[PDB]
Design a protein around this nucleic acid. Structure first.
Lengths: 100, 106, 97, 116, 126, 82, 153
RNA sequence: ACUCGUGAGAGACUGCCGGGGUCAACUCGGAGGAAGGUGGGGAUGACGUCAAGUCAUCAUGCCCCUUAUGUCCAGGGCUUCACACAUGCUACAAUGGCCGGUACAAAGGGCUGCGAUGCCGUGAGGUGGAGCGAAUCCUUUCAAAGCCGGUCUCAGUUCGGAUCGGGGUCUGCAACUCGACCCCGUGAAGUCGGAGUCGCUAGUAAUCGCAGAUCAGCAACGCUGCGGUGAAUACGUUCCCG
């Protein structure tokens, strides 16, 4: 798509692995049990202070080379346009046209 | 008769002119017309000698009558579209006066 | 008894793998249950042909995984070493449990 | 029978006859009938006066129905209107207030279709 | 013993026949608790009727797949095969009755671009 | 609505703003951008300049409007009729 | 049917009456594939008719069919670039199909609160010559008669 | 042993018989067989047409911006509504609604995912984690229509669910604009729909449920598949379209 947006997606992923791995997950563990004292702890407020880009909810599965944000397939990490072209060329092992 | 015009780009005044020019053809149709639509488009490339493209579709009692013309401006395209639609409706009539010379005789 | 699980994208490759696997384990002198087939697993995906619009034109693709199961008995260390000393085609995987 | 100023239907099963009360639906009718004890399958013409009294006192005790409920709902809507909230001006011009689409639908709040 | 199978559009019936009385054991349930429909019972017992050999064979059946109708059809085909195995010479009467032919009427595969196997999306010329 | 376990969501910015505003019992006009913040009984007297998209609308909180969010009282779209 | 006539489906006889006609009737009243419900409706209607009249369902059903069975109909035929309502002779199979269809359809519009009762009343009236299907047969025969002049082509 | 799973193979080739046929193609009927005449369905789309669609999957000639038409962020918008058109879903009910009992599928998915037993809620759901990279465990042992029993008695109703008030759950940093679901109440239009028009030839139309992709959550009634129950009709090319 756009080079800047392809890059920014990756930057979100490295931000996610750096922050969402433990910082943005221990706060969730605090909020889960009503027994846990969340209200004074401000685990909500502390987790607000974290960057938005820490949250995986901001991620977007784009095509691994093409950058296409829609028509994505999780098995291949490829757009529907690219999967069709590489399967036809025999590039994805064990993939072929269907009949039944 | 009510017409909907789906213009495109910058065609100021084309919608009203097309509406009033096409709505006059209701009397020409020998059967009631339903949901008569028009569409105006302009070619982006300046290399086209007739950039404006006009399309019209009418539903005369279930029979679809469509026409398409090209022109240098909205007014010329609308006028040519009106002439084309008039010719099509003339050829569509199907009433007795237009189907009396083809019925076997003698 | 240990299970040898054979998964392949290719039918002929899976058959060859089973055949020489049983060949070497019966060379080493072990009782084999034979290449028991397992249900083929099918993955199906439907895509649209054209880059833009034209939704009504679709392509289907599938991926087919064939599965073979080998069960042997009397696991002598000679058979164990022979098993760890086998070269296999890259289409076929081996799971030893 | 006259129940809280509401004339019950001529012949209905008791919970569904009680549904005719403005503050009672079906679940409320079923649970209150179970609580006070009168049978649910028994008709309206078989009610004894003591039964009318016991439903009267129970309903007036742990329920609010009819005029009080109507006026409380009206007052709530009016107060929601007068504070200037989104639902306020939504109520003022007779449009759906729960985020419903209005491009094509919402003739219920708009009333019957008008032409122009 | 003798055992046969009948197949009807994803319904499979494995049948075992003995010379006992006219008792049906469909996975431990009788012809009433299983198949509570008179038409299905006719479809089941038709080969016996045309072969005259009703109430002289005790049947056990293992059923899997399909619904009641497909299961009944597969069971009838399996009964016909068991009858022909037990007595060959009545093949005409059964074969002219059509009970010896498997029915290749399966669910047609759905196609892309259509709502169903043959139903097409509504097309408005306007 | 927000789950009861998590507690009401109020942004920290206007939070510390209102604690420093109510500590001297004076209620000056507070200008904020966080429409998503709910209304706390600590806002009863304060008036907020809540963002709309073009400007800030002044909203004087009362006891009735507690529990709502600020964005309720800053209508975004302007429609007058055809 | 451009390449010739199509084969007919040989529907089977009924279990509790042993006649083709009742099976045809249950197939006609069949809706959404609920064959059990259609069979229940037809059997109940036949039993109701038996209780009312005291005779066998099948004989009065056949009497009703013969009462509502048409013999002449009207079809739109185009000869010489002109269309006319030509009376045409009806084959026996088409007459039986039309009679059964009329019986079912007119029984569906009755006001007897239940399909079984409506069907029983309709079949009894057709047996006695009072049903609306009898009226439809009279009207279609009248229309065939009125256009007899166009019978020559 | 019977299914089933998946490897190899056989089996339909007008092979045989009778008759039409230029004794030619081909055609009608019959036997056999599971299947008879390209068995059923798919994949496969000739030269080209319509300057068809796509400079927004991607690439690209030329032109243009380059302290911006590039790039970062918050908020908002793409969800606006006096109307018009199109595709669908739910209905207008007794071939039904509600309640209780009860029987049968196929296919597919699952590791920081599927997630059971148990316990707490009326219910979304909460706690908890058994077992599973899975013909094993979980999606419940899988369904609903279906069958049996009770009730409703033709009414704008025990139909229909819109709209609205209040109270909650889950995800997400955040459900105001702008999520889904749960509970209580509320109970609109709607009485089978004009001119006109669409789909379908058999496991088809109709109807019922299940699963998957995308996906933190969902606007999914959409799309792609799977099975359950399963019809009517075709006289024949005069008219309509290609």
């Amino acid at each position: 798509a756009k080079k800047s947006k392809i890059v920014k997606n990756e930057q979100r992923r490295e931000l996610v692995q750096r922050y969402a791995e433990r910082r943005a997950e221990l706060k969730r563990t605090i909020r889960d049990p009503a027994s846990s004292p969340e209200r004074r702890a401000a685990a909500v407020s502390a987790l607000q202070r974290l960057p938005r880009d820490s949250s995986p909810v901001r991620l977007r599965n784009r095509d691994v080379v093409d950058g296409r944000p829609r028509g994505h397939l999780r098995k291949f990490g490829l757009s529907r346009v690219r999967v069709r072209e590489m399967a036809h060329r025999g590039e994805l092992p064990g993939v072929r046209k269907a009949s039944w | 008769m009510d017409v909907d015009v789906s213009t495109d780009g910058e065609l100021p005044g084309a919608a009203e002119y097309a509406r009033e020019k096409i709505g006059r053809l209701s009397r020409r149709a020998h059967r009631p017309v339903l949901h008569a639509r028009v569409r105006l488009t302009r070619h982006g490339d300046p290399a086209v000698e007739r950039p404006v493209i006009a399309q019209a579709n009418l539903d005369v009692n279930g029979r679809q009558v469509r026409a398409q013309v090209e022109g240098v401006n909205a007014r010329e395209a609308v006028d040519r579209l009106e002439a084309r639609l008039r010719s099509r409706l003339e050829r569509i009539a199907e009433h007795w006066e237009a189907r009396r010379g083809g019925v076997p005789a003698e | 008894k240990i299970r040898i699980r054979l998964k392949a994208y290719d039918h002929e490759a899976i058959d060859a793998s089973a055949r020489k696997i049983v060949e070497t384990v019966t060379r080493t002198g072990a009782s084999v249950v034979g290449p028991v087939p397992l249900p083929t697993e099918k993955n199906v995906y439907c895509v649209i042909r054209s880059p833009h619009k034209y939704k009504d034109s679709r392509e289907h693709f599938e991926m087919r995984t064939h599965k073979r199961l080998i069960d042997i008995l009397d696991p002598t260390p000679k058979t164990v070493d022979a098993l760890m000393r086998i070269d296999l085609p890259a289409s076929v995987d081996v799971n030893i449990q | 029978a006259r129940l809280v100023g509401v004339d019950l239907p001529r012949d209905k099963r008791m919970e569904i006859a009680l549904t005719y009360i403005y503050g009672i639906g079906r679940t409320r009718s079923n649970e209150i009938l179970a609580a006070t004890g009168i049978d649910k399958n028994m008709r309206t013409k078989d009610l004894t006066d003591d039964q009318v009294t016991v439903l009267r006192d129970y309903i007036e005790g742990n329920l609010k129905v009819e005029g009080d409920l109507r006026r409380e709902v009206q007052a709530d809507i009016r107060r929601k209107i007068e504070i200037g909230c989104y639902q306020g001006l939504r109520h003022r011009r007779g449009l759906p207030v729960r985020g419903q689409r209005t491009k094509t639908n919402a003739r219920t709040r708009k009333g019957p279709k008008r032409t122009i | 013993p003798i055992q046969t199978v009948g197949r009807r559009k994803e319904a499979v019936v494995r049948v075992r026949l003995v010379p006992g009385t006219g008792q049906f054991n469909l996975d431990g349930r009788t012809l009433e608790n299983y198949f509570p429909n008179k038409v299905h019972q006719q479809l089941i017992k038709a080969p016996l009727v045309t072969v005259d050999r009703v109430d002289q064979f005790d049947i056990y059946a293992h059923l899997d797949g399909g619904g009641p109708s497909g299961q009944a059809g597969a069971l009838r085909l399996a009964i016909a095969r068991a009858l022909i195995l037990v007595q060959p010479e009545d093949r005409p009467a059964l074969k002219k009755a059509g009970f010896l032919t498997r029915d290749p009427r399966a669910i047609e595969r759905k196609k892309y671009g259509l709502k169903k196997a043959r139903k097409a999306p509504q097309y408005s010329k306007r | 609505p927000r789950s009861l376990k998590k507690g009401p969501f109020v942004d920290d910015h206007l939070l510390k703003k209102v604690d420093v505003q109510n500590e001297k019992n004076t209620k000056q006009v507070i200008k904020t951008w966080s429409r998503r913040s709910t209304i706390i009984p600590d806002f009863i007297g304060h008036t907020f300049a809540v963002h709309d998209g073009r400007k800030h609308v002044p909203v004087f909180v009362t006891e009735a409007m507690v529990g709502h969010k600020l964005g309720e009282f800053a209508p975004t779209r302007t429609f007058k009729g055809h | 049917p451009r390449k010739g006539p199509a084969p007919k489906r040989p529907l089977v006889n009924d279990p509790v009456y042993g006649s083709q006609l009742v099976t045809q009737l249950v197939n006609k009243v069949l809706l959404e594939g609920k064959k059990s419900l259609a069979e229940r409706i037809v059997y109940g209607a036949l039993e109701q008719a038996r209780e009312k009249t005291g005779t066998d369902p099948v004989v009065t059903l056949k009497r009703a069919l013969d009462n509502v069975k048409p013999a002449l109909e009207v079809r739109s035929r185009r000869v010489g670039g002109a269309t006319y309502q030509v009376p045409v002779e009806v084959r026996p199979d088409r007459s039986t199909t039309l009679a059964l269809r009329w019986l079912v359809n007119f029984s569906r519009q009755r006001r007897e609160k239940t399909m079984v009762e409506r069907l029983a009343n309709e079949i009894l009236d057709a047996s006695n010559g009072l049903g609306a299907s009898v009226k439809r047969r009279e009207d279609t025969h009248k229309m065939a008669e009125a256009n007899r002049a166009f019978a020559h082509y």
